[PDB]
RNA sequence: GGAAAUUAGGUGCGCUUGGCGUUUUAGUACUCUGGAAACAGAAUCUACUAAAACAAGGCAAAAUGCCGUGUU
DNA sequence: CTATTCAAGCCAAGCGCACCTAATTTCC
DNA sequence: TTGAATAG
């Protein structure tokens, strides 16, 4: 049977709707569901990888200084360095003798904390904040007559501390101090120059971005040549050739000849430049002026500027011509013609200047050319700037067509046309199904990439089950992801400090659900320069934050006609202006008697904002100054036909992949895409309800609507192959037919597929280290910290003290400080944070009790937390530690259900238990058997099944998806529901229960079975193996 | 019912004219994007509603019709376009409408 | 829709660093006891400084040494 | 077991290439 | 959102 397939491709979901071509009945519908492939996951991986490298290399730096000190008998294994203050030793060493132990302590402290090297040229005015640039500048002015160690020791003596945000210095300042220290100590200790060079080397050296990591690294590379060539792209017309370097001589000559061949000259002779005039323009203007002007071109062929058209133009309007960069850079050093007129040599120089990244490597490789360059010229060439990036063509393509650029007037695309050279198309021949690998080339965002891979697998499963469709119709979601989302919660403004300290307090107070609207009104506020666009009255930022519901985001063209929900259709205006506007365009509204400004004033203010840098969009301007009557049906169908294409890059790439696939293998499938808002547009006119927290089915519903959309646009075109109101009534009639609408609303066999995750070596455990204590009963308790003690909204300390003051360690040790704290709690008990009120009223922080009032400020307070069960003991890393030191939250890999004497039990496998062997992973058998013994699982027990994240489990007849082991000791597992989240399930019932499903696997468990789905949601029960799997590849 | 001239704007292609048609319940606003000079200069009121207009915008009738929100003084359609221009010319200059 | 160029902006992969942060140990200050005082003892709370560990762990063996939270 | 409670490493600084968007000129 | 401890 013949069918139409609709797809709704989202961030977390792929909805599919399969409906009949003739009957228009729904054959099947469902949703494939998966985690968002957010970039923060990889960001975190590569961040942690980078943090491991820093830590390893700083340790290796310390050990190499330590070996230098051993080699010169300045350190032994018997050396005692404990009581030496290295600040005092560093200061005193700058002018007096240090003992061997003091000298070693000073050098080792310098080596551990050695400063930045790359901020050092940049200096800023102080804005008094957490920037390292500003702190380097403040410290550079504080060091004008002081060494680093001198300033640090003054901070230690006056303020009582050295470490922290203040402690950021330049490496070159540590080097100055280290040289003065070594200059003094060489008079008193037996060192040589090799000591000084080796130590200063260890102190200042680090790797460069182009050197990368040491030998053996999968992330590394053997030389700069390999590094750059693997990064750089390939030619458009010769895809096995690497691109030319951007500023190669022949590439800029190619650009210049393209610029000249696109000129049209108003004169009695030829409209186009002939060869010898191009020769004279290259040799007399482009090889004489660094930035050529139109006046110099016109003077060289003896016309005036207005007789010349066709030139590229700046945004200012000034004419733009190719600059001959290497020619003029090498020319200012050297005008010898055996250098400057060797095009091949200039290309080689430009390649070397672009690939290699330092002056010394430039000089070595330029010297290795064995040219007629002098050494003094090579040293000046090596310091040229700007040699970065690639041209989009290879030199093969450029040098292939350069002669025809000289002696014809054709530009590059005409010449590649005449030569029958076409950009590369990827072969798709011996493929039984759509491969996911062609996604890897063209896509950029990881979220869209996962969605596309899942969309292709869904299409392949649909063609495999139902056969080939006649039409595939696709809608991609829009209007943000939840990634750039968070980047507006981080970026927050350009004018950061004084404003963003108070939006940060407003946004954090505000719940995460109803707070994206406010940041979008801020975005619109900044692009409208704080002006309501319908009254041209100022909107105060502060009033927008305290009273956001006094300012509305209005759709420029109404949703009833536009179906555009981007920033190009939305503006920020006052509530009463959006109310008086109503269902109108700005033209209709401002021309009435309801407006406070005229349309002409509005149009001038919009057209002046239409210009400039960071300008308002062209489609925004076209919406704002729409003058047609949007109530007329021809205009409405113009808005539909114009804005249904989905012009976006990812969509075009997916359509080209699919159309190429069906074209190559002789499959007649028409594939079309519609834009985002359009289906919601159709539901707004088919009376589909606003409340759609009724589960994941709304994704499959949208896919069903997308499939019937195809019918509407075929029956329109047979209508346009053709007494006005009757015709409008036939377009509007077949647009509005509710026959299929009730057929979708009554559908009730939706299927759901949740993607299962079985990857090993995910996060093993939480980073935070915890100390512990023993009580009188011998229980081991975790010690927790209260910080942010003076934050205004922090009531944690108050609730703890009023409920259970004995939990504070201070309560038992130092009860006089506790009394001070209790007094503040009494005095400001009605406030949310009493220490904040204390600080505000008194200007002081709480100090530790002392009789002379010289007690230290208290900034975090320890209390006795929960009993220690599940943990990783790391105490061995901390020698002579009086208590256990732990990490917590043992992340679970899977649980294995057993049936033992009529009682269901399970073994948890932790990510910690899954060990990487040669080319695979192995469940730890010793940990697995200790788990079986802990759970009293006998050898007579039957293995039932293994359950991973999002495996389906049926417990006591009810089917759930697995989250993970909640509690191994108490046999608890967390699950969620399959057609809906449990949160939404309870909110539909108006139920206040906590939205987590915990199940206890024990004697009240009557039945456990494992199910599974294919990618389309078809359920099947799994026959599990006899044994739990040990190896994962 | 009373017809008011509420808003005008001199364009190159004639003038733009807004007319409010008001009874005790409703305000029906008619936007005439381009009425020619031959009608405006000679007060030919009776020809105005022959010209193309946008769909009328219906809203609740206002309590008074003295001036619009831009500041122009509202004139009854029977009084003519020249009365509207004469009363409002200077403010129309201020608001780029003349 | 596709090709090239100029400018501004954005995203991603990967590389190189900094200062923090958590925790232990030691010293010092703080509290308590003895004492005229150096000092000694107790307490391990609060802070500062140093040294060390920081996904469990796996390589390697003087080395600007390497790998371990991503995707499929 | 049900309902609750607790808390979960961070921000600043620089570089290579790839890709995308927006504006402009020519052609296919 | 999730490991997981706790009061009842």
Short mmCIF file of C-alpha atoms in Angstrom, two decimals, chain A residues 431-622:
data_model
loop_
_atom_site.label_atom_id
_atom_site.label_comp_id
_atom_site.label_asym_id
_atom_site.label_seq_id
_atom_site.Cartn_x
_atom_site.Cartn_y
_atom_site.Cartn_z
CA UNK A 431 24.17 1.20 -0.64
CA UNK A 432 21.15 -0.88 0.40
CA UNK A 433 19.95 1.90 2.76
CA UNK A 434 20.63 5.53 3.64
CA UNK A 435 24.00 5.64 5.46
CA UNK A 436 24.46 7.85 8.52
CA UNK A 437 28.06 8.69 7.56
CA UNK A 438 27.20 11.42 5.04
CA UNK A 439 25.85 13.40 8.00
CA UNK A 440 29.46 13.76 9.22
CA UNK A 441 30.63 16.13 6.41
CA UNK A 442 28.20 19.07 6.15
CA UNK A 443 26.54 19.43 9.56
CA UNK A 444 28.06 21.54 12.34
CA UNK A 445 25.91 21.44 15.41
CA UNK A 446 26.09 18.22 17.48
CA UNK A 447 22.40 18.53 18.43
CA UNK A 448 21.23 18.69 14.81
CA UNK A 449 23.69 15.90 13.99
CA UNK A 450 22.28 13.44 16.52
CA UNK A 451 18.74 14.35 15.43
CA UNK A 452 19.69 13.77 11.80
CA UNK A 453 21.31 10.39 12.49
CA UNK A 454 18.19 9.33 14.39
CA UNK A 455 15.94 10.69 11.61
CA UNK A 456 17.82 8.64 9.00
CA UNK A 457 17.61 5.45 11.05
CA UNK A 458 13.86 6.08 11.47
CA UNK A 459 13.42 6.54 7.70
CA UNK A 460 15.44 3.38 7.02
CA UNK A 461 13.30 1.40 9.46
CA UNK A 462 10.13 2.79 7.86
CA UNK A 463 11.23 1.87 4.33
CA UNK A 464 12.24 -1.56 5.67
CA UNK A 465 8.85 -2.18 7.32
CA UNK A 466 6.30 -0.37 5.13
CA UNK A 467 8.20 -0.12 1.84
CA UNK A 468 9.09 2.99 -0.10
CA UNK A 469 7.02 6.14 0.51
CA UNK A 470 5.77 8.32 -2.33
CA UNK A 471 6.39 11.51 -0.33
CA UNK A 472 8.60 12.31 2.65
CA UNK A 473 7.76 15.66 4.29
CA UNK A 474 10.06 17.03 6.97
CA UNK A 475 9.91 19.79 9.58
CA UNK A 476 12.95 20.74 11.66
CA UNK A 477 12.47 22.51 14.97
CA UNK A 478 13.56 26.11 15.40
CA UNK A 479 13.61 29.18 17.62
CA UNK A 480 16.47 28.13 19.92
CA UNK A 481 18.16 25.11 21.35
CA UNK A 482 18.71 24.71 25.09
CA UNK A 483 22.48 25.30 24.56
CA UNK A 484 22.70 28.88 23.24
CA UNK A 485 19.84 29.26 25.72
CA UNK A 486 22.42 28.82 28.54
CA UNK A 487 24.88 31.06 26.65
CA UNK A 488 22.44 33.94 27.26
CA UNK A 489 22.46 32.91 30.95
CA UNK A 490 26.27 33.24 30.77
CA UNK A 491 26.85 36.12 28.31
CA UNK A 492 24.13 38.31 29.82
CA UNK A 493 25.31 41.62 28.21
CA UNK A 494 28.27 43.50 26.80
CA UNK A 495 28.22 46.23 29.50
CA UNK A 496 28.82 43.54 32.06
CA UNK A 497 29.42 44.71 35.64
CA UNK A 498 26.98 47.24 37.13
CA UNK A 499 23.92 45.98 35.22
CA UNK A 500 24.68 42.24 35.23
CA UNK A 501 25.23 42.13 39.01
CA UNK A 502 21.50 42.91 39.34
CA UNK A 503 20.02 40.90 36.45
CA UNK A 504 22.05 37.95 37.86
CA UNK A 505 20.16 38.43 41.13
CA UNK A 506 16.82 38.82 39.36
CA UNK A 507 17.39 35.81 37.06
CA UNK A 508 18.58 33.54 39.89
CA UNK A 509 15.60 34.39 42.11
CA UNK A 510 13.37 33.73 39.09
CA UNK A 511 12.38 30.15 38.31
CA UNK A 512 13.93 28.48 35.28
CA UNK A 513 10.63 27.81 33.44
CA UNK A 514 9.15 31.33 33.08
CA UNK A 515 12.46 33.16 32.68
CA UNK A 516 13.46 32.62 29.05
CA UNK A 517 10.80 35.15 28.14
CA UNK A 518 12.51 37.80 30.23
CA UNK A 519 15.96 37.25 28.70
CA UNK A 520 14.36 37.47 25.23
CA UNK A 521 12.81 40.82 26.16
CA UNK A 522 16.31 41.89 27.29
CA UNK A 523 17.75 40.77 23.97
CA UNK A 524 15.07 42.77 22.15
CA UNK A 525 15.57 45.67 24.55
CA UNK A 526 19.26 45.90 23.63
CA UNK A 527 18.68 45.62 19.85
CA UNK A 528 16.00 48.33 20.04
CA UNK A 529 18.30 50.61 22.09
CA UNK A 530 15.88 50.64 25.01
CA UNK A 531 13.01 52.03 22.89
CA UNK A 532 9.45 50.86 22.43
CA UNK A 533 9.22 50.78 18.64
CA UNK A 534 5.52 51.78 18.42
CA UNK A 535 5.75 54.85 20.68
CA UNK A 536 9.50 55.66 20.45
CA UNK A 537 9.41 56.20 24.23
CA UNK A 538 12.23 54.96 26.43
CA UNK A 539 11.92 51.68 28.34
CA UNK A 540 13.93 51.75 31.59
CA UNK A 541 15.93 48.56 32.14
CA UNK A 542 15.10 48.59 35.87
CA UNK A 543 11.35 48.80 35.24
CA UNK A 544 11.69 45.98 32.70
CA UNK A 545 13.19 43.82 35.44
CA UNK A 546 10.88 44.65 38.34
CA UNK A 547 7.79 44.83 36.06
CA UNK A 548 8.37 42.60 33.00
CA UNK A 549 4.64 42.00 32.44
CA UNK A 550 4.23 45.75 31.71
CA UNK A 551 6.15 45.22 28.45
CA UNK A 552 5.01 42.71 25.84
CA UNK A 553 6.72 41.01 22.92
CA UNK A 554 4.48 41.76 19.94
CA UNK A 555 4.47 39.90 16.65
CA UNK A 556 4.99 42.46 13.89
CA UNK A 557 2.93 40.58 11.30
CA UNK A 558 0.26 38.60 13.20
CA UNK A 559 0.55 34.84 13.61
CA UNK A 560 -2.79 34.40 11.81
CA UNK A 561 -1.04 35.29 8.55
CA UNK A 562 2.75 35.10 9.07
CA UNK A 563 3.68 31.83 10.88
CA UNK A 564 7.09 33.32 11.81
CA UNK A 565 8.22 32.98 15.43
CA UNK A 566 11.82 34.20 15.10
CA UNK A 567 13.43 37.46 16.21
CA UNK A 568 12.65 38.90 12.78
CA UNK A 569 8.94 39.03 13.63
CA UNK A 570 9.11 40.04 17.29
CA UNK A 571 9.57 43.45 18.94
CA UNK A 572 9.52 44.73 22.51
CA UNK A 573 6.83 47.37 23.13
CA UNK A 574 4.72 48.70 25.98
CA UNK A 575 1.71 46.66 27.07
CA UNK A 576 -0.79 49.32 26.01
CA UNK A 577 0.79 49.74 22.57
CA UNK A 578 0.54 46.01 21.85
CA UNK A 579 -3.05 46.08 23.16
CA UNK A 580 -4.13 48.98 20.95
CA UNK A 581 -2.36 47.48 17.92
CA UNK A 582 -4.35 44.24 18.06
CA UNK A 583 -4.60 42.19 14.87
CA UNK A 584 -2.96 44.87 12.69
CA UNK A 585 0.35 45.58 11.02
CA UNK A 586 2.33 48.60 12.24
CA UNK A 587 1.25 50.42 9.06
CA UNK A 588 -2.44 49.80 9.81
CA UNK A 589 -2.02 50.67 13.50
CA UNK A 590 0.09 53.82 13.22
CA UNK A 591 -2.08 55.26 10.42
CA UNK A 592 -5.16 55.11 12.66
CA UNK A 593 -6.17 57.50 15.44
CA UNK A 594 -4.96 55.09 18.13
CA UNK A 595 -1.23 55.76 17.70
CA UNK A 596 1.08 58.20 19.48
CA UNK A 597 3.50 58.52 16.53
CA UNK A 598 2.96 58.79 12.78
CA UNK A 599 3.90 56.09 10.29
CA UNK A 600 6.43 58.41 8.65
CA UNK A 601 8.25 59.06 11.95
CA UNK A 602 8.17 55.30 12.57
CA UNK A 603 9.49 54.60 9.06
CA UNK A 604 12.36 57.08 9.45
CA UNK A 605 13.39 55.68 12.82
CA UNK A 606 13.27 52.15 11.37
CA UNK A 607 15.23 53.04 8.20
CA UNK A 608 17.97 54.75 10.23
CA UNK A 609 18.27 51.67 12.43
CA UNK A 610 18.23 49.57 9.25
CA UNK A 611 21.75 50.91 8.47
CA UNK A 612 25.03 50.59 10.35
CA UNK A 613 26.88 47.88 12.24
CA UNK A 614 24.76 45.39 14.15
CA UNK A 615 21.86 46.61 12.02
CA UNK A 616 18.26 45.42 12.07
CA UNK A 617 17.48 42.66 9.60
CA UNK A 618 16.16 43.02 6.06
CA UNK A 619 13.20 40.72 6.77
CA UNK A 620 12.56 42.61 10.03
CA UNK A 621 12.41 45.87 8.08
CA UNK A 622 10.09 44.24 5.50
#
